[model samples]
Target: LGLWNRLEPALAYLAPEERAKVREAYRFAEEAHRGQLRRSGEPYITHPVAVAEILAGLQMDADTVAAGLLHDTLEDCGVAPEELERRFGPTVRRIVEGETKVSKLYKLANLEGEERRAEDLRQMFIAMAEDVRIIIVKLADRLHNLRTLEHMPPEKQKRIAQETLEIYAPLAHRLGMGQLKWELEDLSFRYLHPEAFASLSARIQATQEARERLIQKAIHLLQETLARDELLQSQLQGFEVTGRPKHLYSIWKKMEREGKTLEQIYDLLAVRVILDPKPAPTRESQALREKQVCYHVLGLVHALWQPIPGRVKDYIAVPKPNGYQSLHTTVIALEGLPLEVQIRTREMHR
Candidate 1:
């Protein structure tokens, strides 16, 4: 099925007023994009509609959906935000204006050095701080564009994919949106380094059985130890994690930064633990005590295994500037393979 047909059902759950507003925005965008064709020879209206559908999935309000529809209107259709505001409202107009401002700052094509790249990154940060929604909607737009990148030249595809990996993927991570971040990185990696991606996939497939057995053994041991310690009440889950084998570009960048090769970088797989909340005098009071529970869980995990020195990080006490909180540690597993663990509470899982 086409993306639009599948997305239409999501619109049904919206309030009547919100649904009407979204339909109106969709109609306006369709009109503005009429007769326009994308590089892939598809109707340009499809892009904006797809973006609007993505925002709808995020459970964004009507204005965000409307803004998604009009996001490219000013940049590609030559339409003005003031006119949209006069027709729609200030809310939609503001979002359109934010998107427009971000589109104005283009990366200089002539520049061929790290300075230019740094400047472009700075421009992105400026746009991000100005209005985070612009970056979010822009990521959705970029993702669709990348999906249809076959029509573009090889060099153009590589450049765009590299930018997406270096900028958009990390930005999504900072936003605490793991789903988008992983997709962005994986997609970009496929385009920028197809050979590396294929090799990594092959290696992962070959090691699947071994990795699964090791994980099973580790989980079993940890569960038994926790149970013996009377800590079995706290829930622990196991998952087989997969990631892009480091792309050549990423590997090269790390080599440049640390003067090391691919073999030197370890602890890639991330195993996470989500500890159950502890009982307290009151529910509201217990909510405030989740941090202590997270710490206790971390202690239990370390007690069950031997932690590798210099691999421990306590982000809970000093949360990242973006409000990310977790305790990270690397340990030697039963077979002496390095295993990375992240400890957090149920609340932090979100």
Candidate 2:
């Protein structure tokens, strides 16, 4: 099918046998979903393919990718758990069952009310703890639905968007899947507040040129500085610099928190410097070496520009309760603009 072509490239990380297994899953799902259509009027199989593609892009293993492809089969296709286990093995079957249970519980909880919903969530957490891949596949599934939510009725759209923002997005953040969390929030924001989202989108568009220029300048400056540092140049295996945008939901929340307009948000565009630390023998020593490398980069960044007092955070030394690690600092650039910079090891950046 046409959609399989889109998902195939990302499957390059998989072994040939594994890729064939995922293809088998696609075929099974397609056959099961035959004569089915999505609200968007597209083939229903498109969604599972998209979800599998998301997992593949994240470099998930073959079993997880296969599970993602087959996630909706049990619920929508009446596929038996035994059949899934026979075809895709027990792990894939378990993940698919877990996703099916979560969605079913969610719907059942809504019918019963908030107290029941809380109890259902407690069970859902237990399911997720059994296999985190279930949540990963579920998050990807939610994300694709949100992306095409315009096809849904306004009432359903708002409800789904609300659930996505309130529950799924926070779950993604708690999992340290920053990219997924941001997209989930932004997509939900577009549906939840169409007017505000549109206005802010246009405003961000208007300032896009200036923001890109600033981010690019910051990247170039960092690259030049790193090139000049003889010790770093020799010690660091490699480094990359990229611009990170503040998502619309985050900007909206910041505005609400500070009662300031978009223009007043100083850290609209931030720069990240990801260093690949030199290899070390043990896993513990490797972690320690990476932390040292990150600290060294932070010192270099501070020396490059004047840091904002009380704005520096060392999450590496004392990681977040969720285990996120990074060094964040805001500095006044030569152009008098305040720019945020984050330094982390390449592994940590991922």
Candidate 3:
């Protein structure tokens, strides 16, 4: 019940009965973890609750959320797997088992040699191969743990953070879970390089106001441009434009890899243009037409601003290996800064 208030809105998509089942799982987990305390001196139940909240935030199904709540019960609370299956059904039980197996990989994270580590890595993937939700739940669990890593000992913090950076973050990216991957990468980056993280965060903060101003200016310019285009206005129906900030870890990596300072890094703040098209008869037709509309919007954007040479990536035509699709271009915009623009349909945006 502690974090349920915060988690409820995310679960609003579920029916009453399904939500009640998730709540029941929470209560059960709370009762089982009673009197247990984390290194942070808070009730251990808070961990499970936060993990479930993360799953719910991702709009995962009720069973996935329930399994997230009950994930640690078998090992930590001595709850029988059969009992859990009976209570929450087989899916939850199986997912919990998968999570348990994946968590065991943490113990093997300290393996001495690369050969042994490779085997452990394979075991981890094998465990997750059964149900994708297991890794999704595990990723949420790891995210919460990383978020609270300050309470842990320094050595343990570095170990867990390193594992997160090397394993979980890449896994999330492969699964096309961009939001989770970015968070995990930033959290891990903070732990693994404290000074770099602090200075980079400070630098970003120092320019926050200027960046916001520039972004707002760009957004308005695009809004006006789109509004004035009668042909686009009629064809595309509506457009939503927003500014997207680059994640700290990615910014850092780019600066380091390209030997460029933050000032030299372009596209740190980006503009996202989401397009809506008219209705179509079938999903495929809708998607095809949506792609055409996205290209049209991209063309309009380029017409408004000068696009950088060789900086356009047409992912809609050749989607990412992970199936991510978006049309990306870098343009010279306000203050002569390089502004990245990502254009995609509503479905592709999701």
- Which of the numbered candidates is closest to the native, going by highest TM-score? 2
* Residue-pair clash count for candidate 3: 0
| Candidate 1 lDDT over residue span 62-133, tens digit each | 788778888888866768788789877987887777766655554533334565564567455655556677
Q: What is residue 38's positional error in candidate 3, in angstroms? A: 2.5
For model 3, name the residue pairs that clash: none
Write candidate 2's Cα lDDT for 1-350 as tens digits. Answer: 57888999988757899999999999999998888899888999999999999888767879999998899888668789999999999999999998888887677555334544544564565555578888888899999999899898999889998888756887787777777888899999999999999999999899788778878888999889987888876557788898886688988988988799988876545888888777677899777788777777888888988888998998888888767888999988847878888998765653
Candidate ranking under TM-score, highest first, comes to 2, 3, 1
Task: Tell me the TM-score of model 1.
Answer: 0.63
Which scores greater on lDDT, model 1 or model 2? 2
- Model 3, range 1-350, lDDT digits (tens) per residue? 44778777778757999999998998899888988889999999899899998887677879999998999888768799998989999999998888887666666566555654645674667464677888889899999999999998889889988888767888787777777898999999999999999999998899898779889999999989888888777657567999985698998998888798888876466899987676777999777788878877888888989989999999999989878889999998896788889998755653
Give the TM-score comparing model 3 with the true structure, all chains together: 0.79
TM-score (all chains, Cα) for each model: 0.63, 0.81, 0.79
lDDT of 2 at 229: 88
Where is model 2 poorest over a 10-residue stretch in terms of lDDT? 110-119
Runs of candidate 2 exceeding 4 Å displacement:
1-5, 12-24, 76-78, 110-129, 223-240, 274-312, 345-350
Q: Whole-model lDDT, candidate 2?
A: 0.84
